[PDB]
Amino acid sequence: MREIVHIQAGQCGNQIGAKFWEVISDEHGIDPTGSYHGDSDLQLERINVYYNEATGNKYVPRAILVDLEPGTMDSVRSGPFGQIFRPDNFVFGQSGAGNNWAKGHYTEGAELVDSVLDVVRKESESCDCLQGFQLTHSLGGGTGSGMGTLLISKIREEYPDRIMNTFSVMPSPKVSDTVVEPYNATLSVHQLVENTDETYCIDNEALYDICFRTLKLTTPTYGDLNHLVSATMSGVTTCLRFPGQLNADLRKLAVNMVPFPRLHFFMPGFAPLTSRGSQQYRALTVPELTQQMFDSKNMMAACDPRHGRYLTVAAIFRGRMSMKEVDEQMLNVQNKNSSYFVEWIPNNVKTAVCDIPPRGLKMSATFIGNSTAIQELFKRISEQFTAMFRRKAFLHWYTGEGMDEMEFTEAESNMNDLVSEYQQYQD
Amino acid sequence: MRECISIHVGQAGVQIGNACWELYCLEHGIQPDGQMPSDKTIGGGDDSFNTFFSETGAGKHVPRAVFVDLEPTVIDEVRTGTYRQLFHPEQLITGKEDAANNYARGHYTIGKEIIDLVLDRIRKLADQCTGLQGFLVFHSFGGGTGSGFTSLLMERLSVDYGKKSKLEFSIYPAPQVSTAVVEPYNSILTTHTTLEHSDCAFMVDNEAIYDICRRNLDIERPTYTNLNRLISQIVSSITASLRFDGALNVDLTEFQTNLVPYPRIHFPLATYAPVISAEKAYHEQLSVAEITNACFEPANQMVKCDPRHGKYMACCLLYRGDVVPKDVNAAIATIKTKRSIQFVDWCPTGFKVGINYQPPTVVPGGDLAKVQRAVCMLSNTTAIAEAWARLDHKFDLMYAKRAFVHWYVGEGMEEGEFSEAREDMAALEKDYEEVGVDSVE
Amino acid sequence: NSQVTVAVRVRPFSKREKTEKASQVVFTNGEEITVEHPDMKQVYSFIYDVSFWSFDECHPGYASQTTVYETLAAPLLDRAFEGYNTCLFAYGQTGSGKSYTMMGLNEEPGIIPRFCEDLFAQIAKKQTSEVSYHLEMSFFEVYNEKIHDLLVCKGENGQRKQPLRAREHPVSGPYVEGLSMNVVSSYSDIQSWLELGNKQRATAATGMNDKSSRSHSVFTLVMTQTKTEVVEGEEHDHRITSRINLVDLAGSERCSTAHSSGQRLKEGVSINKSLLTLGKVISALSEQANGKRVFIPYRESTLTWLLKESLGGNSKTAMIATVSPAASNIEETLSTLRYATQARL
Ligand SMILES: CC(=O)O[C@H]1C(=O)[C@@]2(C)[C@H]([C@H](OC(=O)c3ccccc3)[C@]3(O)C[C@H](OC(=O)[C@H](O)[C@@H](NC(=O)c4ccccc4)c4ccccc4)C(C)=C1C3(C)C)[C@]1(OC(C)=O)CO[C@@H]1C[C@@H]2O
Ligand SMILES: Nc1nc2c(ncn2[C@@H]2O[C@H](COP(=O)(O)OP(=O)(O)OP(=O)(O)O)[C@@H](O)[C@H]2O)c(=O)[nH]1
Ligand SMILES: Nc1nc2c(ncn2[C@@H]2O[C@H](COP(=O)(O)OP(=O)(O)O)[C@@H](O)[C@H]2O)c(=O)[nH]1
Ligand SMILES: [Mg+2]
């Protein structure tokens, strides 16, 4: 069977995974004891896609938690859904990163990565046919960027035939939740694009705008933000777990959504989203979901596709629905909004359908899009970056830990070349 | 005595098989447990006809087919579903990984490890048969298993068996609609390998059946359970002369002799005119003339190819139910009388006829109605070149930039093969231009 | 400005094939190179900017080993004396006589020795008490996108093959960290280095022949012009540098026909990826010469990323492709022609 290993690094990845597992357990019927209390039987057919088995008909996930300070791991443990994780996989150390991408990539990250690989090998060798890996990590920060990229580099050499996904939380335009966003994110991108297959570029301003406009919430906490990313992560790996009319999986999307290898930076999206009151005055059909998905007030990438041409698009729907509706509405989208699509690719869209939806919805949908808009996420960084690097603002905290100025100009040129690569297909 | 092995490669082929082995098992009275309630009562007969279904001594009837998908999501619905006790447990559920919609994966990477078992099950059946004629290979352009793997299977069946029939039902790609972006690449790399080895490869389009369903049956929201049944009716009409008894029996060796003039133009189309609902089943006489005029009517064909944009070469017409040949004669006269239907200047005959006395059966929970008679038209045209060109333009537009190629080289496709295959499809697009010309004395 | 100067060379029959009676399938008409099957149906015709028809010694336009040099390389060496970097390529499956064309024989030299000797001869003619010419070299290889140096010896162990890494300088350009560079004043020096490099190179059998090549191999020459010129203090040595490159690529290897499995499959995959990227590079460069504005993806392969500053810019590139005229080898010969053709357009 196809099987995923879920690594998660840092204050973002731990807090995300602690809800993603709390979402998958609801879908497959697992409780905080690890025991099955479901109602149907399709929940056990492919539970080995994520979980492993135990003695007393319990299930334990394939989670690898790799922080560099226990302040967050001690929050998962003392939570609702923490007692199921394998205690030999709460990997961590001390002497935290301090939001220094060097401390988590050369000095205090190499002293712990081998311990992570000692778990990855155990959790891969005990799997029949691995499909790939996952990762949840925040650029700009420390451990999640550095140790995450190091784990990616050290996995891509041992398991290159497989898939490596990263649900990156990229930096945001307006407000900086960390002062060293560019200098870390640039070097994370420089290590991701050469050594990844599909990374999903999430941003937090977009999720604020979503939770405020659509869901009509006044107090959006991060437990509500991650609660979205989890849905997307489930929607991606749905046909790998449940059946449908037209199946799909990670590698099919990687073939269809990656024309050339460097261009695998996607905008995700989930539907249907609505307020607890405004659910009485909306219809549940394919075109409504499609309207909500192809709109810019749902994409988590913090970047408007209307500034760009779509290169390739995917859609993963879940529910007993018709195929003609999908194959008609997508054609209609390509016909009316042609200027937002390329021409040297005649069909820029694909579909996938499952027949087991989410716990409370008659039908759902999920959206992935490669777009030339996302250059603005990096064009900004290379603007934010060089203005600091033109006169070496914060650089002494990185040369001190075993680096050099060449390793910055490398990424600065790579990102700009990628911006050119994307701009080639804009006019 | 007259058997045909059905091979079902991919999700498409397997769902179509779930429809076909529902229709067939309803016809002959078989229950999904594999049993006959009639043979225990009357005490005789072979209505569970031995073309499709085998038989052991305990009073069971096992089919003559094998499934292969390179993924366990589909066949584990059969194993865990309604038809679990009928099939032999040797269905190939080699569910390591899909072909990633990559022809390279399903032709060398995951095309091995699965083939030398598939051939060791097609051979146990052929040694169980006495007068075998055919290999009905359901597959689907675009998919990786359905394209690489089907082509690989054709290469294996043309070396080991040889002087046999090897047919293909296939979902030709819709021109506008698509569930993938690299459908054309796989299609073109398939028709370069499924050409010298196959004998007659039928073709359909899901867009055409979608347009049929919402204009004949009055269904605005259909799905594959409402399409694969019509495909099953096509396959039943094609494979009825071997099961039941009628006046004019048309075997499977008669198609490739009458519809394939040259060995490279074996790509006909299929249609089935009565697709009317119970309400529309009344208010209409259902005579041979109406049907035979509907099978040539555009908007009832099963490929988005306006045949008025081209000429025909041959047309087989397999009928079912209460048909009298006098009416077929009158209808063919009426068709050859018209001018909108051009025929070639070297096939004035242009017709084969086949009749069977059995009516078609009604699947419960279905959309069609009960008919006293039914029809299936196989038709070879020079119109289908339009779609090969529409499919080649896409290939060229993407192979100029050379997109989606690093995934194919990553599994063992060099660089020449995309260029080499596309030069083999120009010859086929040129042959169709040759045959359309009228000769000179 | 950037040019590509594609060319093709057809070898004549070997003694092996003249005995075994190998058929003829490739013919010429001036700038047309046609490929006729034995009896199949039809013919393909290919146009190239340059063509070399070494089938018959008595045909017109016989392209001997001298005319191969006086039509492709010598412009690169009369352009490298100006101060520009140059890159000459090579592509052909084993048996088409790449080695006969580049290195050659003791009595029939290829391109390399004539090139180096014309160089060293022009030096002494072009040398004074103020002007000089210093030449250092290198010889490295690519294996599964991993760089490797060939001049240094390996120990008697499992392996001493250290995978050096590529880096980007902000001004000069990309380079390798740890690349040994040695000096030359006579061609015997370079011969003594290549006679060790090609021994240390990767090579193996898959299903057809025991001696093959499974790794790209670059041979670089750095050339300098330390000239002293000023009438104030006899200083201000205005020095110019030039980078010549003569790479020897590998076969493309349809894997199915060979049933590759293990440490051959990876190699074929990586080789074909490098070929595909190099194709895009050359095509987009030729399109850039016509005034367009496009993106050259050097970064998708180590070889191009280590030659960003030798192909693009005010440099010159060159390519000669080898093919056999026999009928036994016709699926591996049509590929070469289609490859170089797209490299031309
Ligand atoms: C009466 C009713 O329909 O309740 C709905 C509901 O009100 C709405 C608003 C639900 C509700 O979700 C939210 O309001 C919400 C939105 C953003 C962040 C946090 C919460 C709901 O809470 C969420 C919940 O979502 C689900 O469908 C699954 O239960 C959900 N499971 C979980 O996320 C989960 C989390 C923790 C513990 C257990 C389960 C899910 C969704 C996608 C994939 C897997 C699981 C549902 C139907 C509802 C409620 C419960 C009100 C919606 O949920 C989703 C994910 O689509 C929000 O918009 C949809 C539309 C639903 O109508
Ligand atoms: N008519 C019909 N077509 C189908 C059905 N299921 C899939 N298809 C067609 O199949 C095409 C895609 O190929 P796949 O269904 O994936 O075939 P496959 O063998 O599974 O290929 P892989 O997914 O790569 O393994 C789509 O364009 C559909 O039109 C079906 O149930 N009925
Ligand atoms: N969505 C989300 N983002 C978070 C959360 N916690 C931190 N972040 C983001 O992560 C970044 C800070 O990096 P951090 O995780 O502290 O560095 P690390 O501990 O080394 O991984 C900021 O951009 C935050 O917006 C969370 O719970 N949810
Ligand atoms: Mg499939």
Residue numbers in the entry:
A (entry chain B): 1 to 427
B (entry chain A): 1 to 441
C (entry chain K): 391 to 735
Question: Anything the authors wrote about it?
Answer:
KIF14 is a microtubule-based motor protein with essential roles during cell division. KIF14 belongs to the kinesin-3 family of motor proteins. As all kinesins, KIF14 possesses a highly conserved catalytic motor or head domain that contains nucleotide and microtubule binding sites, and where ATP hydrolysis is coupled to the generation of mechanical work. Here we report the near-atomic resolution structures of twenty KIF14-microtubule complexes corresponding to five distinct KIF14 constructs in four nucleotide conditions mimicking four key steps of the ATP hydrolysis cycle.
Construct K743 includes 8 neck-linker residues. To investigate this issue, we obtained the cryo-EM structures of microtubules in complex with the constructs K735 and K743 that have truncated neck-linkers. We surmised that an absent or truncated neck-linker would mimic the situation when the neck-linker is mechanically pulled out from the docked configuration as it may occur under force or in a two-heads microtubule-bound intermediate. In the Apo and ADP states the motor domain structures are very similar for all the complexes investigated; this is regardless of whether the KIF14 construct contained a truncated or a full neck-linker, they all conform to the open configuration. All the KIF14 microtubule-bound structures in the ADP or Apo states are very similar with the motor domain adjusting to the open conformation. All the microtubule-bound KIF14 open structures have the more twisted β-sheet conformation, regardless of the nucleotide species in the active site. Consistent with the structural results, we found that the K735 and K743 constructs have reduced microtubule-stimulated ATPase activity relative to the longer KIF14 constructs.
